[PDB]
Design a protein around this nucleic acid. Structure first.
Ligand SMILES: Nc1ncnc2c1ncn2[C@@H]1O[C@H](CSCC[C@H](N)C(=O)O)[C@@H](O)[C@H]1O
Length: 353
DNA sequence: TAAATTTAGATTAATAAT
DNA sequence: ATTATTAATCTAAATTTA
């Protein structure tokens, strides 16, 4: 039977909403150690999440929209073997509505733009010609109290399609890097250093975790590991899970990071340094060159991996991909199985057989 | 030569309408 | 209920700036 997305997309329960569930039946092959956490986009081509679940011990995915955790939607799926009781959110939560997240937008927001939430944060922002086209479309009716509904359709559909916010007289501009940084739960300028360019900043932010959601999911580890954890971070990026564990005050004794982008690794090393992390950070580039024996040796040296967290590329799954949305076997999304390979190695030592 | 700026629809799920 | 519509969507790549 096909996997059907839950409506509402509250997963096993979100804060301030009904429907919390504290118990879950997990397959025996799914039991830890290690605890593992896999994330990807929910809106994939057909049959993708079924294959991911089949390769991850048949764990039914938890489908969560981060719009219950911040101002911007993020319909993601997470497969894990974590306990689902005693979850708690990191404090303080991000601003929930557009009115609170963008305090100056009052001055420019139109009454007919009835948006309360922003759409998903992607790696492609609206173009300046888009802002100028909306400005030119609405200027003729400046002296009129409200433009007729036929242009309202166009402008509202463009604002939703490109996730624009009102900043000037008739200016609907996309989000700025620090804006999506705060919305995605990262501290200010978390991705500003390391010689990363603005374009690379956008691409890395669009591809990242919403820290509050992942932290709500990972909070159950705090009572389990009083003296810190060993982390295997696959497809680390700008370090979503690391920031989440940092906000959860869960000591990260060791982090083996695997991330091919050098500016991403520099951002992770920066975050490690500016937060004065006591533990050790090890960085790897290509997961395809990470050998099974390297994983086994690292485990023997440090004592296994308490948690294996990652999100393989959603490249060939995202609906925004025009040319190469070929599914799980795409050149980049297929790296998912790489994840599964390293996970098995870890399991081979912690539970064995 | 790195950045930034354009230049490009399709696939499903959700919702409304038979 | 079967199905029309409405809607959301962690992008790729070819130019052009600077
Ligand atoms: N072959 C490979 N080996 C290691 N990492 C890879 C890879 N191919 C792609 N990646 C990386 O995998 C990442 C997935 S995006 C996940 C990062 C996000 N900040 C998060 O916290 O989850 C991308 O940053 C991409 O650069």
């Amino acid at each position: 039977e096909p996997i059907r997305l839950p409506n509402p997309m509250i997963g096993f329960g979100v804060p301030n909403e009904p429907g919390l569930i504290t118990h879950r039946s997990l397959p025996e092959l799914a039991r830890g150690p290690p605890f593992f956490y896999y994330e990807n986009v929910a809106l994939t081509p057909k049959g993708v999440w079924e294959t991911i679940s089949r390769h991850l011990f048949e764990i039914p995915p938890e489908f969560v929209d981060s719009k219950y955790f911040c101002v911007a939607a993020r319909k993601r799926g997470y497969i894990h073997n974590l306990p689902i009781n005693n979850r708690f959110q990191i404090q303080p939560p991000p601003k929930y509505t557009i009115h609170d997240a963008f305090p100056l937008s009052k001055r420019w927001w139109p009454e007919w733009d009835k948006r309360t939430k922003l759409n998903c944060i992607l790696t492609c922002t609206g173009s300046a010609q888009l802002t100028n086209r909306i400005r030119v479309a609405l200027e003729p009716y400046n002296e009129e109290p409200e433009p007729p509904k036929h242009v309202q359709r166009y402008v509202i559909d463009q604002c939703k399609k490109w996730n624009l916010v009102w900043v000037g007289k008739n200016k609907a501009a996309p989000l700025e890097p620090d804006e999506m940084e705060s919305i995605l739960g990262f501290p200010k300028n978390h991705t500003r250093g390391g010689g990363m360019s603005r374009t690379e900043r956008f691409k890395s932010l669009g591809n990242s975790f919403q820290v509050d959601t992942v932290a709500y999911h990972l909070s159950v580890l705090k009572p389990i590991f009083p003296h810190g954890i060993n982390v295997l971070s696959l497809f680390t990026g700008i370090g979503g899970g690391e920031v989440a564990l940092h906000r959860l005050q869960i000591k990260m004794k060791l982090v083996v990071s695997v991330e091919i982008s050098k500016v991403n690794r520099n951002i992770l090393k920066d975050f490690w340094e500016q937060t004065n992390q006591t533990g050790e950070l090890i960085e790897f580039s290509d997961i395809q060159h990470l050998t099974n024996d390297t994983i086994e040796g690292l485990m023997e040296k440090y004592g296994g991996f308490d948690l294996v967290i990652g999100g393989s590329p959603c490249n060939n799954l995202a609906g925004g991909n025009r040319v190469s949305r070929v599914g799980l076997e795409g050149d980049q999304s297929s790296l998912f199985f790489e994840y599964c390979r390293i996970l098995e190695v870890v399991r081979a030592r912690m539970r064995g057989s």
